[PDB]
């Protein structure tokens, strides 16, 4: 699982990249106001 461990490690990391406001806007449906 040397390949499983890396891979998980790599998965968690793509899910942990900085996010642009632009990226975020496309993430959400209408009807929400940003605090």
């Amino acid at each position: 699982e040397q390949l499983q461990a890396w891979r998980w490690e790599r998965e968690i990391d793509e899910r942990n990249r900085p996010l642009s406001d632009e990226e975020l806007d496309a993430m959400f449906p209408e009807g929400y106001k940003v605090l």
Binding site: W8, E11, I12, E14, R15, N16, L19, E23, L24, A26, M27, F28, P29, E30, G31, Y32, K33, V34, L35
Partner: protein, 114 residues
């Protein structure tokens, strides 16, 4: 460490209606730096919110601790974000565009909350 559904963005349901920005940040920020918080402000969305964490481990921690946690006189429902669930009230057809737009531009997962 962390399963496939865990995400930096949390979906909150059963929020008290009269909750301030302060209070949100107070409640959720305890678990780590906050990227942002969107709050439901139309009849169909009042009581729900999305809180975005800067770090996925913080999100994971907060979701553990806050799901079913009592605030005011209500138990919060907190769930991990899911692109599909978040765009349910979209008409069956127009859903696809956004769902595919997201999966293509930003590579984030489109699959239903399975």
């Amino acid at each position: 460490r962390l399963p496939p559904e865990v995400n930096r963005i949390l979906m909150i349901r059963n929020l008290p209606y009269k909750i301030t920005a302060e209070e949100m940040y107070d409640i959720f920020g305890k678990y780590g730096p906050i990227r942002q918080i969107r709050v439901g402000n139309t009849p169909e969305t009042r009581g729900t919110a999305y809180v975005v964490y800067e770090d996925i481990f913080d999100a994971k921690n907060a979701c553990d601790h806050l799901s079913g946690f009592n605030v005011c006189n209500r138990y919060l429902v907190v769930l991990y974000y899911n692109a599909n669930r978040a765009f349910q009230k979209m008409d069956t057809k127009k859903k696809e565009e956004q769902l595919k737009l997201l999966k293509e531009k930003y590579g984030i997962n489109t699959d239903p909350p399975k």
